Curated annotation (Swiss-Prot):
Disease link: Muscular dystrophy, limb-girdle, autosomal recessive 2: An autosomal recessive degenerative myopathy characterized by weakness and atrophy starting in the proximal pelvifemoral muscles, with onset in the late teens or later, massive elevation of serum creatine kinase levels and slow progression. Scapular muscle involvement is minor and not present at onset. Upper limb girdle involvement follows some years after the onset in lower limbs.
Compartments reported by the entry: Cell membrane, Sarcolemma; Cytoplasmic vesicle membrane; Cell membrane
Task of the protein: Key calcium ion sensor involved in the Ca(2+)-triggered synaptic vesicle-plasma membrane fusion. Plays a role in the sarcolemma repair mechanism of both skeletal muscle and cardiomyocytes that permits rapid resealing of membranes disrupted by mechanical stress.
Species assigned in the record: Homo sapiens
Impact when changing residue 68 to D: In MMD1 and LGMDR2; Reduces calcium-sensitive phospholipid binding and interaction with AHNAK and AHNAK2
Subunit (UniProt): Interacts with CACNA1S. Interacts with ANXA1; the interaction is Ca(2+)- and injury state-dependent. Interacts with ANXA2; the interaction is Ca(2+)- and injury state-dependent. Interacts with CACNA1S and PARVB. Interacts with TRIM72/MG53; interaction is required for transport to sites of cell injury during repair patch formation. Interacts with RIPOR2; this interaction occurs during early myogenic differentiation. Interacts with CAV3 and PARVB. Interacts with AHNAK; the interaction is direct and Ca(2+)-independent. Interacts with AHNAK2; the interaction is direct and Ca(2+)-independent.
C2 domain residues: 2-102
Protein name, entry field: Dysferlin
Residue range from the parent sequence: 1 to 124 of 2080
Domain notes: All seven C2 domains associate with lipid membranes in a calcium-dependent manner. Domains C2 1 and 3 have the highest affinity for calcium, the C2 domain 1 seems to be largely unstructured in the absence of bound ligands. The C2 domain 1 from isoform 14 does not bind calcium in the absence of bound phospholipid.
Length: 126
């Protein structure tokens, strides 16, 4: 019935041409974008935020993916894309616990690592 996601933190976050990182996380599922708050001045931002997607009747299948993007609010309306990951929700459907944790490297637009990583927890619950 719902996808529950806990965005805990990111590590080694570095914004190009800035001394300190001002990062927030953008998550999109079921056509719904949710955002964490911005953590000012941090290489290891701890958002510790819970998100709940009403799946509006759509169940997960094995192609389902949660898209997460970390961005700096050096820049606002424009992006300041720092890195992104696609987390495979098939792993959630893989054990009876209907939950999975991810420690996912963030990739650039060339889909190559940024050095930063994002830690999150995902749960499929009624």
């Amino acid at each position: 019935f719902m996808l529950r996601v806990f965005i805990l933190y990111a590590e080694n976050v570095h914004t190009p041409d800035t001394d300190i990182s001002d990062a927030y996380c953008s998550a999109v599922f079921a056509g719904v974008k949710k955002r964490t708050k911005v953590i000012k001045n941090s290489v290891n931002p701890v958002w510790n935020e819970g998100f709940e997607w009403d799946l509006k009747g759509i169940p997960l299948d094995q192609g389902s993916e949660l898209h997460v993007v970390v961005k700096d609010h050096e820049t606002m309306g424009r992006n300041r894309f720092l890195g992104e990951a696609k987390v495979p929700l098939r792993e959630v459907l893989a054990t009876p616990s209907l939950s999975a944790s991810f420690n996912a490297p963030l990739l650039d637009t060339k889909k190559q690592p940024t050095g930063a990583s994002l830690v999150l927890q995902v749960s499929y619950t009624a």
